[PDB]
Amino acid sequence: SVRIREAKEGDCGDILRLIRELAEFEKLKISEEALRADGFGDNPFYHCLVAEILGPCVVGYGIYYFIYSTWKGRTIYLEDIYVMPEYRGQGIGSKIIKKVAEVALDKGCSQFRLAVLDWNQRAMDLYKALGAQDLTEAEGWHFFCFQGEATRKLAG
Amino acid sequence: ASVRIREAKEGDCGDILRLIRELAEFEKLSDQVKISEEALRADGFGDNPFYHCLVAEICVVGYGIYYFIYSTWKGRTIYLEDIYVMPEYRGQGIGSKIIKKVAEVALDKGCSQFRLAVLDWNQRAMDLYKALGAQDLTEAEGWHFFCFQGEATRKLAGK
Ligand SMILES: CC(=O)SCCNC(=O)CCNC(=O)[C@H](O)C(C)(C)COP(=O)(O)OP(=O)(O)OC[C@H]1O[C@@H](n2cnc3c(N)ncnc32)[C@H](O)[C@@H]1OP(=O)(O)O
């Protein structure tokens, strides 16, 4: 059986290995020391769940953080989304999504956001199934980003 | 017009919400306004705020609302979530002046990663931000802004 639970400092080794998996999947910094140094400390800027089979081992993760929307109020942003290849399509990806849903309400967040890769069609179809809205296509939102000098200039 | 940009104080929440409502009312999307004045005060003027707000004051006629994130591609980052300037003050460069400050906040914090989203109709801001060093993300990388709103949320939580 599988259980989606909040992560503990003890899972930071597995989480680091899963961060290097998902990104390799998405194609393009944070050592274990970094994970504990912020993800738990006392002033966490981000938290997460660790899909764990019950020998008991970490088989995927979901990390999120609290952001803000001017239409509803307390929002939740679900960043990284990844399940081990052998363990996909068997309900785990959704259980992580549902858990993020529970945390949202429990924390006064009625809605939740996230970004998605265009070629990553399967996931998009997953999110749409569970009720998500592709605001990029349903409204026209175009993510935009500055890096280094670009931000320096923007700042005037 | 004689205007200054400044950090919002809990007392600016009434004007911030009034402005948010004026916008939504303009787009005929009022019914989508679920935020509250009490939430604006609490969600950012207590323990650990969900957002930060800069207001353009002459009478508050505009605002900028941001906060930081924690993705996984480049680490911490400042993110602009919304900017509004009353119609009577458009063309004055206030919104342009507000964004510059949000960028200065990031740099002042030691962060050079600045993110945001742009509306599809905007044909100047985009090509402009590019001439600055930025790059649209949805037209290129294929990044799509997905949103699980209220109906889907509760349903997922089990309700
Ligand atoms: C915000 C983001 O971070 S988006 C990044 C998402 N991550 C990735 O693409 C990395 C590689 N893939 C994965 O990690 C997983 O395949 C996930 C997270 C996308 C989906 O988790 P899964 O456990 O495979 O999906 P789960 O079984 O819970 O499926 C729920 C729905 O998604 C669909 N789905 C999405 N991806 C897959 C997949 N790779 N294999 C099988 N089904 C998939 C299912 O068919 C199901 O849809 P349906 O009800 O219409 O049939």
From Swiss-Prot, chain A:
It is found in: Cytoplasm. One of its GO terms (molecular function) is N-acetyltransferase activity. The active site is at 127 (proton donor). It comes from the Eukaryota. Keywords: Acetylation, Acyltransferase, Cytoplasm, Transferase. GO terms for cellular component: cytoplasm; extracellular exosome. GO terms for biological process: nor-spermidine metabolic process; putrescine acetylation; spermidine acetylation; spermine acetylation. Widely expressed. Under physiological conditions, SSAT2 is expressed at lower level that SSAT1 (SSAT). Many tissues express only SSAT1, several tissues express both SSAT1 and SSAT2, and bone, cervix, ovary and pineal gland expressed only SSAT2. Induction: Not inducible by polyamine analogs. It catalyses: S-(2-aminoethyl)-L-cysteine + acetyl-CoA = S-(2-acetamidoethyl)-L-cysteine + CoA + H(+); an alkane-alpha,omega-diamine + acetyl-CoA = an N-acetylalkane-alpha,omega-diamine + CoA + H(+). Acetyl-CoA binds at residues 81-83, 89-94, 120-122, 127. Its main location: cytoplasm. The modification N6-acetyllysine is found at residue 27. Substrate binds at residues 25-26, 79, 139. Its EC number is 2.3.1.-, 2.3.1.57. Residues 2-155 form the N-acetyltransferase domain. PROSITE patterns: GNAT. Belongs to the acetyltransferase family. Catalyzes the N-acetylation of the amino acid thialysine (S-(2-aminoethyl)-L-cysteine), a L-lysine analog with the 4-methylene group substituted with a sulfur. May also catalyze acetylation of polyamines, such as norspermidine, spermidine or spermine. However, ability to acetylate polyamines is weak, suggesting that it does not act as a diamine acetyltransferase in vivo. Homodimer. This is Thialysine N-epsilon-acetyltransferase. It comes from Homo sapiens.
